[PDB]
Amino acid sequence: SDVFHLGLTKNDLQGATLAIVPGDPDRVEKIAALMDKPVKLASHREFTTWRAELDGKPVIVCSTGIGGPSTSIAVEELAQLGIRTFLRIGTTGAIQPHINVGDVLVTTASVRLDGASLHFAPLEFPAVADFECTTALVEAAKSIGATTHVGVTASSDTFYPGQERYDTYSGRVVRHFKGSMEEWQAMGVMNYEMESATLLTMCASQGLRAGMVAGVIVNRTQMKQTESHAVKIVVEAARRLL
Amino acid sequence: KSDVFHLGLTKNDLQGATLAIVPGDPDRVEKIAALMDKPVKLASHREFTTWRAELDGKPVIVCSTGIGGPSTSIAVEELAQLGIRTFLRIGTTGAIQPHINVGDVLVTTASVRLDGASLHFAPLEFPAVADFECTTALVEAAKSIGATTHVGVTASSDTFYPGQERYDTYSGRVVRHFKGSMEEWQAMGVMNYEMESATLLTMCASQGLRAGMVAGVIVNRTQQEIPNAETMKQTESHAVKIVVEAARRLL
Amino acid sequence: SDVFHLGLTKNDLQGATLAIVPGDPDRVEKIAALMDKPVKLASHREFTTWRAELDGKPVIVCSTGIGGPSTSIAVEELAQLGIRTFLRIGTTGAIQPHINVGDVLVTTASVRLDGASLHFAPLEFPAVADFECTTALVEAAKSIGATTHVGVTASSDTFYPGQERYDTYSGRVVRHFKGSMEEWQAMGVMNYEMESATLLTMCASQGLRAGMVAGVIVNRTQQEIPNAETMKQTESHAVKIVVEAARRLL
Amino acid sequence: SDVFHLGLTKNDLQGATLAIVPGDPDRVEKIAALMDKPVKLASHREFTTWRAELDGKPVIVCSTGIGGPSTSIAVEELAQLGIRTFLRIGTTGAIQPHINVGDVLVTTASVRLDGASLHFAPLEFPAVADFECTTALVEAAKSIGATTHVGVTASSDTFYPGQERYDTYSGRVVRHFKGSMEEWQAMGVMNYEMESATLLTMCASQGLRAGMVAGVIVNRTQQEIPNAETMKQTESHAVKIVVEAARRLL
Amino acid sequence: MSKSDVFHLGLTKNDLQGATLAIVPGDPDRVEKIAALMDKPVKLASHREFTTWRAELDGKPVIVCSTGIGGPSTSIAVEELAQLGIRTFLRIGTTGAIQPHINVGDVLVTTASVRLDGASLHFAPLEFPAVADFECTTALVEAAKSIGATTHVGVTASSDTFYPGQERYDTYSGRVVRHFKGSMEEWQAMGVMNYEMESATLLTMCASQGLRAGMVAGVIVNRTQQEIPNAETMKQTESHAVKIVVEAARRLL
Amino acid sequence: KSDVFHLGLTKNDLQGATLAIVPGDPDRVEKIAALMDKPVKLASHREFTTWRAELDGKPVIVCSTGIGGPSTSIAVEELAQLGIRTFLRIGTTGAIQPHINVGDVLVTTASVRLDGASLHFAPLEFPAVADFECTTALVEAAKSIGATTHVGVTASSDTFYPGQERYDTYSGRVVRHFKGSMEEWQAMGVMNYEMESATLLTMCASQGLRAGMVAGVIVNRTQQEIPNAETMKQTESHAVKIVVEAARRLL
Numbered sequence A: 001s002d003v004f005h006l007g008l009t010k011n012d013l014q015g016a017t018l019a020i021v022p023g024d025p026d027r028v029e030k031i032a033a034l035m036d037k038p039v040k041l042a043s044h045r046e047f048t049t050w051r052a053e054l055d056g057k058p059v060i061v062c063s064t065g066i067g068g069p070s071t072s073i074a075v076e077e078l079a080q081l082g083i084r085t086f087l088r089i090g091t092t093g094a095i096q097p098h099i100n101v102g103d104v105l106v107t108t109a110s111v112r113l114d115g116a117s118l119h120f121a122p123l124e125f126p127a128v129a130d131f132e133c134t135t136a137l138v139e140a141a142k143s144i145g146a147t148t149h150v151g152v153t154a155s156s157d158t159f160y161p162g163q164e165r166y167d168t169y170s171g172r173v174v175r176h177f178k179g180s181m182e183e184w185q186a187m188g189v190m191n192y193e194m195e196s197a198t199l200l201t202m203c204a205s206q207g208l209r210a211g212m213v214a215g216v217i218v219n220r221t222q223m224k225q226t227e228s229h230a231v232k233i234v235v236e237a238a239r240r241l242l
Numbered sequence B, F: 001k002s003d004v005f006h007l008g009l010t011k012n013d014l015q016g017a018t019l020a021i022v023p024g025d026p027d028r029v030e031k032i033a034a035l036m037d038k039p040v041k042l043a044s045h046r047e048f049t050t051w052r053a054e055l056d057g058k059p060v061i062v063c064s065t066g067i068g069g070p071s072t073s074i075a076v077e078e079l080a081q082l083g084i085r086t087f088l089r090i091g092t093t094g095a096i097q098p099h100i101n102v103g104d105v106l107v108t109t110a111s112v113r114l115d116g117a118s119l120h121f122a123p124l125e126f127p128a129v130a131d132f133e134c135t136t137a138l139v140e141a142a143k144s145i146g147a148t149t150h151v152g153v154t155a156s157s158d159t160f161y162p163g164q165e166r167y168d169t170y171s172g173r174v175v176r177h178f179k180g181s182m183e184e185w186q187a188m189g190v191m192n193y194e195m196e197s198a199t200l201l202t203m204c205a206s207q208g209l210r211a212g213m214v215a216g217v218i219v220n221r222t223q224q225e226i227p228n229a230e231t232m233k234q235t236e237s238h239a240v241k242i243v244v245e246a247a248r249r250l251l
Numbered sequence C, D: 001s002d003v004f005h006l007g008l009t010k011n012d013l014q015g016a017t018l019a020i021v022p023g024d025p026d027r028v029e030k031i032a033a034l035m036d037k038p039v040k041l042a043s044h045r046e047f048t049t050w051r052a053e054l055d056g057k058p059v060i061v062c063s064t065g066i067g068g069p070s071t072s073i074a075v076e077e078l079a080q081l082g083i084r085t086f087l088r089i090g091t092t093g094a095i096q097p098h099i100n101v102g103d104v105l106v107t108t109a110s111v112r113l114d115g116a117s118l119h120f121a122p123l124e125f126p127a128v129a130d131f132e133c134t135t136a137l138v139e140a141a142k143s144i145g146a147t148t149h150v151g152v153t154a155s156s157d158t159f160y161p162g163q164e165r166y167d168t169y170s171g172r173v174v175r176h177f178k179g180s181m182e183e184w185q186a187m188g189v190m191n192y193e194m195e196s197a198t199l200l201t202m203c204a205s206q207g208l209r210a211g212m213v214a215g216v217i218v219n220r221t222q223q224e225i226p227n228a229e230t231m232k233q234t235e236s237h238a239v240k241i242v243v244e245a246a247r248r249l250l
Numbered sequence E: 001m002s003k004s005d006v007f008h009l010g011l012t013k014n015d016l017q018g019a020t021l022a023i024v025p026g027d028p029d030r031v032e033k034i035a036a037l038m039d040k041p042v043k044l045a046s047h048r049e050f051t052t053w054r055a056e057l058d059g060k061p062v063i064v065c066s067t068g069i070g071g072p073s074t075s076i077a078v079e080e081l082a083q084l085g086i087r088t089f090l091r092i093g094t095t096g097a098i099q100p101h102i103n104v105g106d107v108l109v110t111t112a113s114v115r116l117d118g119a120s121l122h123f124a125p126l127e128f129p130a131v132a133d134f135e136c137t138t139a140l141v142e143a144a145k146s147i148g149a150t151t152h153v154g155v156t157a158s159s160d161t162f163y164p165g166q167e168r169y170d171t172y173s174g175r176v177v178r179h180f181k182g183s184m185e186e187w188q189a190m191g192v193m194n195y196e197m198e199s200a201t202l203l204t205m206c207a208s209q210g211l212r213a214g215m216v217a218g219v220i221v222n223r224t225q226q227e228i229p230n231a232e233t234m235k236q237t238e239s240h241a242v243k244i245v246v247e248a249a250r251r252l253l
Ligand SMILES: O=c1[nH]c(=O)n(COCCO)cc1Cc1ccccc1
Pocket: A023, A066, A090, A091, A092, A093, A094, A159, A163, A192, A193, A194, A217, A218, C004
């Protein structure tokens, strides 16, 4: 093993430069099976890595897990293995009334409500997606004819209080995040998720291309085929970036 | 006489314009407007000079922001009050990467917020990101005219000297916070320094307004410091042609 | 399922109030097998849950994954199901020359180099462990006999730059963390890990009891690369302590 | 030109060490006209410069534009050309009920709601005016018999949200500035303007003398619309004070 | 052979007679009272807010030195005592409870403090925990059990201010700055037991410099029940607290 | 026998006094009070010693704050509750500029806020500025007794050692934030270090109270560290004379 956590060698990658990074290690199989020749490489902790072939080119699918910390481990160790392009596919909760469940969202940049992004760049540095990756995701979304929204995402280090969920054990939200969802809503923030800020910050500050796409399964103001549309987009976008 | 506090403009003066090209220098306003059809002067107050022009039979606004976020925030807000929804900034810049040359054009995806005014619209964690349609149109226009183009992050500073780590000053010192900052931005892939983008991009992205940012390189910090007069005028003319062509796609 | 992620009902726990929380879901099977009647309950994403019995009382073993974010999900959803006591078992990298590989470390409180803890309490609030949980873990370490150190742990949101590793792709560390390891070293900080700051903060600020124990598998001052043979014996040593500590808190 | 923006050489100043620095380039000639031998030097961007004579000694008038960023350019480049004393003449909106339109305000120090000041000194450093400049301004105001208030000014990087204006496109203010005007009011802050924090901080931290004086054209507690009946007299009153204070500092 | 080995305390290392443990009350008037509970009590020095006494406990020299109110003077006292050879610190204070279940007369042992002070930042950044030494904490808790008391163990809010930082409105201005407006309620919901004014500095500076520190306090007021303390209960609570800190010192020698 | 929580004073004890001289040291209170007519001890509790004296037939309070903002904040608040509206601090200080000598008197216009207590009254951006009338009176009084005076900015620290970059300690280390801090303050023209002014000036300027700050230089950090036995009293005498003379102008 060349890496500390993923349990992979540079040879296992077969010269892959692009990697599709879902949050769920159980989704890794689903995405890899859509491409030609799916092969399981290694499964350690929350990192399941599958190698596939797209247009005659080797492509890596590797889970990041929930949150910036394990995302930062996976992305760094994949970069050590030779990956230059990272395309994230996630689930999301929309906070705008006009965004329906089932919609696909392309993130231009993220509100940094995480801690790991700070370990790569100070807060003033924008958690911006790569322009070529964003273009490929937008054009791929139009290719399969999905309802798409492009804009800013709030990337939280937590699922509950940082997304202002009150349906909890304590039933309280710390002062800092009290009324925060309404603030993001008025600022035109589309949605909540938990990985983008870290991924986009660490890639844009280290000379790596990164894209972010998500499927809406819940709208906070108001499931199978939702992932089907999004997975088809991230694979189609990968075709354009190879 | 005026609907706004600073610009000296009425909604009627705009003639239904929704797009504004926003240079920093008031002296550049007429030069940009002269490239389009039916150029007419509207107003001049403080650092805010406004001209109206026509593009593909549609009214377009040219309005100076002045140097820095504060006067930019005034101009953008008051233009939004009069009906402007799309803002295309054209500015000057100093590059900090060796591979970018003098004369090159830079399209900003998002900005490092080394300003104060952006914080008056959104907390620091909010990205100073440009609108996707605007950025696309600027990149597409740059390739259309045939120019050396770089796309990426811009450091937007409230200061010309210490915040861009210049030591050739009266004091000769840089505050601890900005000591060694240029080298950090360089390693982080930041292309350049300017003084308005962070405020403009933050206030637009957090208020439902479309904003784009483009700049011509007149100096490279890793190479020289004294720019050439002829090269400066040619660089400005190249970037102005790009921003006007980008405006065409966004009407 | 009564929760959004773990895939467990209140009935699945059988009135369990204590939970041992490892980072690695592959460790969940190992820890639960050392107790009486081990049964697998669920496995979703990075959350693997096993039910066990200790001294005639049901106990939970549930993986949090690496980092505060998923740790915050696991703890919150277990608290919804009735868990009031949390005992973290982890792996760590020691930064003090006097601490060796194979040693067991008990955390009194953590340096908050994480983001999730801020979602529960402002930075000024201490990421402190429960006194009874800390007492039990130290007493359990004294019981089975192992070289133990009690003190402060640096809990980072990252494995590399936040722990000042330069052996990376970029080879650079952000200004904020430049010379940080030396700073913590002089401050008497024992070690680096990635989950304690979040767990300790969210529990201490929500009326939940939390303890933190870790086995030293690497020392940052001398040796290079964790040995496979030493890793297994250090893991099993710390696991024995956490189960014995769970006995004292029930 | 010896400088990057002002378009001035050291010779143009003729030994001047004092500058009066208004925000509006149009006000420059009007200030210079009150002194002997007023001469235009340059006009580039928002930076217009005039040279005049006071008591047989050369004095500079130079516009900064709105905001700290362009102020920081004007002041720095003027300092390179030899200016040691900077006297700001501005306009302002009062936030205290007892301060009337037409009143003159002398700033002892500023609340730093700007970005540029941070590029010279960290937030904890006070945006304090020079004692001699402040004394001169206060004494100059007493000579002409103007209604004068001496105290703290809130210096904002923005005209609208940072001054808690809601009559805007969005009609909202970011959380940080929500209820901020009321806070400053209770704290005895006199007024809002947009250049003083930057000027005072960069001068006080670099060994340069700076004073701040402003005329009240609006009081935020009574109305919003500036009264043209007094908007002519207010500027004339304050311009006279800054010129008289310059005489005392020559 | 000397007069003072330090800048403020007016003490020589020789005055300490080999003492490594100090009990540190806030009040200089409380110094004599704590020392008189131990053998051979002698006054060493009185300068500014720093009053120092030496006493004997189980045949071992022990120091009692007042820090004064607040982190700044605490930082001077702890640093200069550390220069004189002190390696263990036990703080005994007064405090106001903010939890409804904590009564006046109860004793509180602090595991760690909310850092609402400035001086702690001069030793470690905010993210560093203001945590008490585990052995010192064990000593204080066991000492409370041994002599019998109502004891609560947990987090203390340590404020650089008595009034606004503890959300007192019955003041000259009657206002509390935005940052601290509604702060007591937040601390209450977070399970914070009490307010005092020295622990954050003491615990941060000791834990970040290899010095052992403990923190104990007697509640003379409950904020949900009253504002003005009873003069009689104050003395009884103090006496009760003084005995616990001396007994904890016995177990640390 | 007390209207307040700590000081042990009633409004009647002040006899209508509106001005207080506030040293850091309780032991110094009598020395300052003895410089005026008919000095009487009022109270001594904790680090708070209060004396009352007569100045030109008018009552004047002398009350110790103790070292640091926290106890300063208690003393100032409770004195304000008792009717004090003007506060004149007399302190000791360590100078950090080479041109300032031991024995010199420093008048503070405003303070660098290296304290915690000032934040409990006003956010960091608020200036720890002295009252203009109080500063004027202290500068005028300095000329009245004929002392060498410097007027400017003071760094007010919550600690004597690391926050003033002293390495002569038990640990021998200074936290990253204050590493190289003295040099920065020196370059910024900061005159000196003390431990009470930031809190006093901030809490007074934000609550409608008048505050002045003066200090006697007993050590200069660029020449020596141990304060002299003979010189200490000489600088104390001059500085104490100025604060009393400044009080005369403010009655
Ligand atoms: O609201 C959300 N917030 C969020 O951070 N995500 C992202 O996926 C992360 C973990 O489930 C997904 C959602 C949708 C959702 C809603 C309810 C239950 C589960 C998932």
